């Protein structure tokens, strides 16, 4: 819009964006399968990447690991949940291996795990959710958001006041 380069750059380091997994055969909403915890269809609950076992999984933005499960074969199975800035969190589920520990700091692009089929997975996949203050968002809008396609995430505006956020970021980037 009238957003400078620096605003956009900082936003894409702090707020989840892009692909947390770099190989998949398809993407599907979790709503159209039996939910991991609540064993039913029709739950708004992020997405599934249909991916081979042990495909690397990457953090979609900087932040801190607030929750991990390892050696679990129930529900979500093995997972990482990252708390990001400005209320956003990302969760990565059904993993085969987890590489990070609870309470560690995380950088965007960091290896956090490897996909699997642990828990109530319906098979080999990465389950992914983006959330704002605990509320489920359309994960696809965050996938497709990058420097060259910046409007994508701003379309998810039911809970999030994007203009207000960038006003906060302008103040931060203004320093240099």
């Amino acid at each position: 819009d009238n957003l400078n380069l620096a605003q956009k750059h900082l936003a894409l380091m702090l707020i989840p964006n892009g692909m947390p997994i770099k190989t998949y055969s398809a993407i599907k909403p979790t709503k159209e399968r039996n939910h991991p915890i609540k064993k039913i269809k029709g739950v708004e609950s992020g997405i599934d990447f249909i991916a081979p076992l042990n495909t690397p999984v990457y953090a979609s933005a900087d932040g801190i690991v607030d929750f991990v499960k390892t050696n679990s074969n129930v529900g979500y199975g093995n997972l990482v949940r990252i708390e990001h800035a400005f209320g956003f969190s990302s969760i990565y589920t059904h993993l085969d291996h987890v590489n990070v520990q609870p309470k560690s700091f995380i950088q965007k692009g960091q290896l956090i795990g490897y996909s699997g089929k642990s828990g109530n997975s319906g098979g080999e996949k990465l389950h992914y959710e983006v959330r704002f203050l605990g509320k489920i968002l359309d994960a696809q809008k965050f996938l497709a958001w990058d420097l060259d396609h910046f409007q994508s995430a701003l379309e998810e505006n039911k809970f999030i006041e994007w203009k207000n956020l960038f006003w906060v970021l302008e103040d931060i980037v203004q320093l240099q």
Partner: protein, 166 residues
């Protein structure tokens, strides 16, 4: 570098969130209200209250809130939160984005309170945190907080924060 200081100070809470406290000595007593050590800052009702760093209003709750009274929780980057309690008035809502130093409410005497004061907390995830380590942290006395609040893994946080710039 000093540029990094300012930048760091936009994201991690610091300084006093009432103007009169940041003036007198920087330019306060310890109190456990709800499982965490807060700081009680005596002040008249309707003293303006300012955000200690940038973030999102995670909770703007007009209620009893465990004896906190009217309560704002600001969620900052990297697992830091700040709490502003006993407020008389709240001028931000849940999900609002605020910048450092922005007016978020007015002090009061609501909740479990014996006289009018701000109850202020700095939190980091789920671990105990001394709020004075952050309220005394300022542009002059900058390096101090790394040696006063050693339990935070500053080395990882600094690196990451420095990478954010360019």
């Amino acid at each position: 570098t000093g540029l990094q200081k300012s930048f760091i100070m936009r994201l991690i809470p610091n300084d006093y969130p009432l103007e009169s406290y940041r003036r007198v000595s920087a330019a306060p007593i310890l109190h456990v209200l709800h499982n965490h050590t807060g700081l009680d800052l005596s002040t008249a009702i309707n003293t303006p209250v300012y955000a200690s760093a940038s973030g999102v209003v995670g909770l703007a709750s007009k209620g009893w809130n465990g004896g906190y009274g009217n309560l704002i929780k600001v969620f900052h980057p990297f697992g830091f939160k700040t709490y502003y309690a006993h407020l008389n008035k709240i001028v931000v809502k849940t999900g609002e984005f605020v910048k450092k130093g922005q007016l978020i409410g007015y002090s009061g005497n609501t909740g479990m309170s014996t006289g009018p004061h701000l109850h202020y907390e700095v939190r980091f995830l789920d671990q105990p945190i001394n709020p004075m380590s952050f309220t005394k942290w300022n542009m002059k006395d900058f390096e101090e907080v790394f040696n006063k609040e050693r339990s935070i893994r500053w080395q990882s946080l600094i690196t990451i924060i420095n990478r954010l710039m360019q």
